[PDB]
């Protein structure tokens, strides 16, 4: 029979799915502010199709962000999400009022305590090995209060090919055993085994099923690594010029 | 500024996207009739997620089928589509009341009159070459009143691998120059150059833009060949276990 709401549950990636930075848009084209930088100034935007799409989607379905952003960076997203969120590559679940889900935090803590020393050392070694290559890098450990989640590294050369080289060497030096990687644009991330958008979306669906039974689930994402959580949905979707769509084009 | 409707225009494939035959569903699981066979009896069904999804989508957006079915087979689809349709692999556009679009019919006629003799001969040769292989086939020319569109061939062996063999030989005998092919499940189709879902969706969007300007366009399809029209949308989407999704999985 029917229980709860019939409307779709839609898991949406954020950066380069709902909005993007200025450098990824054609100059002068109209835009709406979607994110702020740490100094409080606009730094991410929606074009006219994008703001029309997310407005319709938020009005029509239960929309849940599934993002690499940590909680602070997610709080700089200026979109009226009302159902909570998955943050930090699946390391964090937020309730609808923005408060931290204590149960998931306990489970993630358990999965991640074997990595708490390795993560700062891995970021340090990557940033050193990057300067050894002569590359001007930038990186840090993404973390919540008390718990370190994953390592991120960016380049300042305006050449994303730099990061593919480091990934090749770090892999050969055997630094990534027990971990998986995300690479898209100027972003290279090293994630512990038990940290994944897929795991948090899997838990979100388990909880939803007790309230709403089986209802249509849709996943939207732009990265190849977003296929993890997107594969848990009944239908998945991607922007026409995404990293994922471009890879499908070449297949 | 804003003009017309803001709601998304959603192009949806039909078979194996919104519904499927009984043999493609787990026995005994609940279902809703979605299509009738030529004898008027149910032969295609939606599972509970599928009927919930298409109901929500029809209510929330302007939904336009984009189907290989000819007009007669489309008329046996028992879903309340209200905006017209693209049929016969892009060879036919129907108005919302089901009447034939005369302009597109004239354009398709022009593209297809160099193929009017080749299509019946190609179906005959394929069905003969199939029996030469010892395979029990079935095929015909798909056509509207006066105009032949494409060739379809099916096998009766319960082995879809049979069709991949014929495609290999027919290609070597040089019978498919100036044409493209569709193969998914128990369906192998040979299409003339100017016959494509992509071309009809392209024309549909050109016409829509004069009424509604630029609004979000979403494409849903299950076949690799559906990527043609799906690439014209802002976002495209596929069922989790589709032919397309399975190919992406292997990439
Ligand atoms: Ni993204
Ligand atoms: Ni289909
Ligand atoms: Ni129902």
Q: What is the 3 state secondary structure string of chain B?
A: CCCCCCCCEEEECCECCCEECHHHCCCCCCCEEEEECCCCCEEEEECHHHHHHHHHHHHHCEEEEECCCCHHHHHCECCCCCCCEEEHHHCEEECCCCCECHHHHHHHHHHHCCCCCHHHHHHHHHHHHHHHCCCCEEEEEEEECCEEEEEEEEECCCCCHHHHHHHHHHHHCCCCCCEEEEECCCCEEEEECCCCHHHHHHHHHHHHHHHHCCCCEEEECCCHHHHHHHCCCCEEEEECCCHHHHHHHHC
Q: How was this structure determined?
A: X-ray
CA atoms lying within 13 Å on the CB side of residue B46: 19
CA-based nearest residue to A215, from B11, B20, B47, B62: B47
8 Å CB contact of B248 and A251: yes
Whether B241 contacts B16, CB under 8 Å = no
Resolution (A): 1.8
CA-based nearest residue to B190, from B239, B225, B228, B236: B225
Long-range CB pairs of B2-6, under 8 A, 24+ apart, other chains included: B2/B213, B3/B211, B3/B212, B3/B213, B4/B211, B4/B212, B4/B213, B4/B215, B5/B62, B5/B212, B5/B215, B6/A52, B6/A55, B6/A56, B6/B215
8 Å CB contact of A52 and B216: yes
Q: How far is B176 from chain A (nearest CA, A)?
A: 22
Q: What CA–CA distances, in Å, run from B180 to A157, B89, B137, B139, B247?
A: 44, 12, 20, 17, 19
| Pairing of the two strands A62-65 and A9-12 | parallel
Whether A153 contacts A139, CB under 8 Å = yes
DSSP code for A90: G
Mutate to test the interface with A, among B235, B243, B246, B250 (most CBs of A within 10 A): B235
CA atoms lying within 13 Å on the CB side of residue B129: 19
Cα–Cα distance, A88 to A195 (Å, whole number):
9
Q: What CA–CA distances, in Å, run from A154 to A149, A160, B189, B242?
A: 17, 8, 48, 36
Q: Does A241 touch chain B (CB under 8 A)?
A: no
Cα A189 to averaged position of ligand 2 atoms, centre (Å): 37
Cα–Cα distance, A160 to A165 (Å, whole number):
10
Cα–Cα distance, B213 to B5 (Å, whole number):
9
Q: Does B42 touch chain A (CB under 8 A)?
A: no
Which tokens belong to A11?
């898991």
Which tokens belong to B114?
């160099």
| Residues 6 or more apart whose Cβ sits within 8 Å of residue A48 | A30, B214
Q: Please list every residue in chain B followed by a chain break, i.e. its C lies more than 2.5 Å from the next written N.
A: none
| Pairing of the two strands A147-155 and A137-144 | antiparallel
Which tokens belong to A54?
């997310």
The SS3 assignment for A230 reads helix
Cα–Cα distance, B116 to B249 (Å, whole number):
39
| DSSP per-residue string spanning A188-223 | EEEEETT--HHHHHHHHHHHHHHHH-S--EEEE--S
Whether A217 contacts A11, CB under 8 Å = yes
Burial A177-187 (b: 16+ CB within 10 A, else e): eebbebbbbbb
| Pairing of the two strands B235-239 and A235-239 | antiparallel
Whether A104 contacts A203, CB under 8 Å = yes
Q: Please list every residue in chain A followed by a chain break, i.e. its C lies more than 2.5 Å from the next written N.
A: none
Q: What CA–CA distances, in Å, run from A166 to A160, A163, A184, A220, A247?
A: 11, 5, 14, 29, 21
Any idea what the Cα angle at residue A55 is, between residues A49 and A61, rounded to 5°? 125
Phi first, then psi: give them for residue B236, nearest 5 degrees: -125, 160
Cα–Cα distance, A116 to A146 (Å, whole number):
10
Cα–Cα distance, A98 to A102 (Å, whole number):
12
What separation, in Å, do the N-terminal and C-terminal C-alpha atoms of chain A show?
42
Long-range CB pairs of A162-167, under 8 A, 24+ apart, other chains included: A162/A130, A162/A133, A162/A135, A162/A137, A163/A187, A163/A188, A165/A133, A165/A135, A166/A126, A166/A129, A166/A130, A166/A133, A166/A135, A166/A137
Write out the H or E segment, with its range, that includes residue A152.
strand A147-155
Whether B160 contacts B186, CB under 8 Å = yes
Which tokens belong to B104?
């597109």
Cα–Cα distance, B6 to B2 (Å, whole number):
8
Sign of the CA dihedral with A118 first, then A120, A123, and A126 last: negative
Cα B192 to averaged position of ligand 2 atoms, centre (Å): 19
Q: Does B58 touch chain A (CB under 8 A)?
A: no
Cα A15 to averaged position of ligand 1 atoms, centre (Å): 4
| Residues 6 or more apart whose Cβ sits within 8 Å of residue A89 | A68, A142, A149, A150, A182, A189, A191, A195, A196, A197
Cα–Cα distance, A234 to A236 (Å, whole number):
7
With helix as H, strand as E and coil as C, how does A4-63 read? CCCCCEEEECCECCCEECHHHCCCCCCCEEEEECCCCCEEEEECHHHHHHHHHHHHHCEE
Cα–Cα distance, A7 to B218 (Å, whole number):
18
8 Å CB contact of A239 and B235: yes
Cα B45 to averaged position of ligand 3 atoms, centre (Å): 13
Cα–Cα distance, B40 to A50 (Å, whole number):
43
Long-range CB pairs of B41-49, under 8 A, 24+ apart, other chains included: B44/B15, B44/B19, B44/B20, B44/B77, B45/B19, B45/B20, B45/B21, B46/B18, B46/B19, B48/A214, B49/A214, B49/A215, B49/A216, B49/A234
The CB density around residue B49, as the number of other CB atoms within 10 Å, is: 16
Whether B249 contacts A86, CB under 8 Å = no
8 Å CB contact of B227 and A220: no
CA-based nearest residue to B165, from B199, B123, B137: B137
The SS3 assignment for A171 reads helix
Cα–Cα distance, B220 to B226 (Å, whole number):
8
| Residues 6 or more apart whose Cβ sits within 8 Å of residue A171 | none
Cα–Cα distance, A248 to A239 (Å, whole number):
12
Cα–Cα distance, A67 to A187 (Å, whole number):
13
Cα–Cα distance, B235 to B233 (Å, whole number):
5
| Residues 6 or more apart whose Cβ sits within 8 Å of residue B41 | none
């Amino acid at each position: 029979g029917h229980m709860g709401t019939n409307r779709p549950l839609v898991f949406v990636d954020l950066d380069d799915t709902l909005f993007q930075t200025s450098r990824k848009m054609v100059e002068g084209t109209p835009r709406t502010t979607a994110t702020l930088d740490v100094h409080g100034q606009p730094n991410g935007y929606m074009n006219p199709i994008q703001h029309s799409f997310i407005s319709w989607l938020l009005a029509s379905a239960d929309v849940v962000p599934v993002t690499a952003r940590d909680v602070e960076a997610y709080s700089r997203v200026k979109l009226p999400f009302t159902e909570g969120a998955i943050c930090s590559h699946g390391g964090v679940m937020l309730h609808s009022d923005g408060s931290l889900d204590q149960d998931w935090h306990g489970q993630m803590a358990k999965s991640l305590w074997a990595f708490q020393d390795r993560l700062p050392a891995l970021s340090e070694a990557t940033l050193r090995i990057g300067k050894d290559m002569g590359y001007s890098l930038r990186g840090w450990v993404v973390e919540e209060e008390g718990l370190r989640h994953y390592v991120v590294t960016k380049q300042n050369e305006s050449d994303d090919a730099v990061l593919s080289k480091v990934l090749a060497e770090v892999q050969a030096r055997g630094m990534l055993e027990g971990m998986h990687i995300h690479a898209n644009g100027n972003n290279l991330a090293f994630l512990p085994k038990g940290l994944a958008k897929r795991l948090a979306v899997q838990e979100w669906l388990r909880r939803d099923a007790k309230i709403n039974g089986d209802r249509p689930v849709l996943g939207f994402g732009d990265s190849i690594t977003d296929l993890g959580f997107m594969g848990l949905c009944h239908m998945w979707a991607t922007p026409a010029r995404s990293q994922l769509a471009k890879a499908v084009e070449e297949m």
